């Protein structure tokens, strides 16, 4: 069918040092996809980096992960064709100092756990989960995006401990700031707990999880009459108490988050 491979770039979806993502609409079918555009000339290692990110994206196929359709190289430019999520970023559904309705946060939290369980099941950790990277489709289904920091932590049934310091400070687990090596899975569980805090309170609990940060010390001392905790009902707060545990070995795992009381409370009506 002539022209079915032509796509018009009609809108900037996102921009950053990594490059940009544009909304692409098919010339013939008007199908919409997002196209991430990367100039491999921007950094000496961008070549290996983007190659790794495409490798990882090729391994993924889950309803709560941004689908990867393929890629094309044009000289120094790499074009990644990705699932377009018309509801934009979860970031923009979080009202400052309010958050969002608890049942809505619970449904987004269920979908985030589903995508994270999927990734960990195939041995991939994301390493930078935050609202800016959790996208929404036309029906508000959540899809994890941006595997630019993703890496394999399990291969051939053997776990590799991680040591790279990466992520975003307000969402990063405390063991990355205190230990030379750490397990991957608890770090992604932690950032999911900060995302839940933001969805239910509309504010991040601390600049970083270190004793030097007063807000983090206050949490460790269970001062839950202070914000953001005072804004969170008791049932989800009990779940946050299990997720935001400094020792990653005592931190709740996803199979136990799935058994949590708040997690299983009927709260949200179907669309």
């Amino acid at each position: 069918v002539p022209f079915v491979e032509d796509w018009d770039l009609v809108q900037t979806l996102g921009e950053g040092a990594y490059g940009e993502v544009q909304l692409a609409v098919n010339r013939v079918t008007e199908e919409a996809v997002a196209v991430k555009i990367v100039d491999m000339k921007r950094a000496v290692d961008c070549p290996e980096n983007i190659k790794k990110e495409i490798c990882i994206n090729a391994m993924l196929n889950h309803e709560n992960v941004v689908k990867f359709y393929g890629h094309r190289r044009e000289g120094n430019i790499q074009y990644l064709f990705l699932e377009y999520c018309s509801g934009g970023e979860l970031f923009d559904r979080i009202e400052p100092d309010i958050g969002m309705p608890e049942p809505d946060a619970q449904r987004f939290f269920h979908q985030l756990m589903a995508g994270v369980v999927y990734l960990h099941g195939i041995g991939i950790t994301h390493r930078d989960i935050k609202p800016e990277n959790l996208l929404l489709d036309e029906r508000d289904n959540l899809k994890i995006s941006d595997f630019g920091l993703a890496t394999v932590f399990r291969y051939n049934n053997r776990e590799r401990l991680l040591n790279k310091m990466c992520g975003t400070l307000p969402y990063v687990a405390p063991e990355l700031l205190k230990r030379r090596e750490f397990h991957a899975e608890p770090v992604d569980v932690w950032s999911c707990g900060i995302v839940l805090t933001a969805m239910l309170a509309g504010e991040l609990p601390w600049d970083q999880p270190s004793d030097s940060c007063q807000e983090y010390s206050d949490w460790k001392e269970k001062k839950t009459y202070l914000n953001p905790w005072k804004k969170i009902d008791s049932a989800p707060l009990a779940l946050l108490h299990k997720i935001l545990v400094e020792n990653p070995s005592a931190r709740i795992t996803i199979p136990d988050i799935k058994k949590d009381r708040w997690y299983n409370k009927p709260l949200k009506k179907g669309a």
């Binding site: 079915v4 491979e5 032509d6 796509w7 018009d8 770039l9 544009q22 692409a24 196209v35 094309r72 074009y79 064709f81």
Partner: peptide
């Protein structure tokens, strides 16, 4: 701006 598939 455009791209081919």
């Amino acid at each position: 701006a455009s791209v081919s598939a």
